[PDB]
Amino acid sequence: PSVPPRTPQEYLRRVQIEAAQCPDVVVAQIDPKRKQSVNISLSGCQPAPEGYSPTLQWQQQQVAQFSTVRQNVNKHRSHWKSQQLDSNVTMPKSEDEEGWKKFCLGEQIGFPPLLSIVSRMNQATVTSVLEYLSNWFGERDFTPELGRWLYALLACLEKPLLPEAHSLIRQLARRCSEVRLLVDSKDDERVPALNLLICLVSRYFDQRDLADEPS
């Protein structure tokens, strides 16, 4: 009763009784406040100028098409894996930023993305290279030769993507959206390609916060 408990079962039995005594959740009203640290967040994509935003029906057809491409890429990886070219195609070391840029893009004129060449590319490399090409893209104009490489390397990325890969391809799609603002006719060469890459990233690779939603 009012003598100390003498076993732990008794003690605990007593705490439990005392537990119900107490209100199970309590809320102290306070009175004021202050400032709080900002968490910096990256922008989405820039919407297309009016008229330049592609239709959903185009976007979906593009995605559907890209999937097939990827089916076929992987479906024949091993055939193209065993072929060659020459002293010609030395595939740079996986971490030679500069020589990959020179490899794919040139000032020679640069090797295009042949299955024979990209099928030899392991996942960490495809990732790295994409990056090298992202970088080169921030600091140079978008050529159609760049387009093909990006599209190719995108056709060789395997899901599920690692988070850094998602972050990378998102960065690229932001950059496409930004360059797209510079444009001034629909007739511009960049337009179809930039819309295309934004699509594949936003709709093929699940970043739909970045997608061009028309209207």
């Binding site: 008229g51 592609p54 593009q62 098409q65 193209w80 072929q83 093909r148 599209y151 056709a155 179809p192």
Partner: peptide, 18 residues
């Protein structure tokens, strides 16, 4: 068909008519 990606690129850039 060692340039079949290169072709699918060109083909999709081309699919654009707006």
């Amino acid at each position: 068909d060692d340039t079949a990606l290169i072709k699918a690129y060109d083909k999709a850039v081309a699919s654009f008519k707006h």
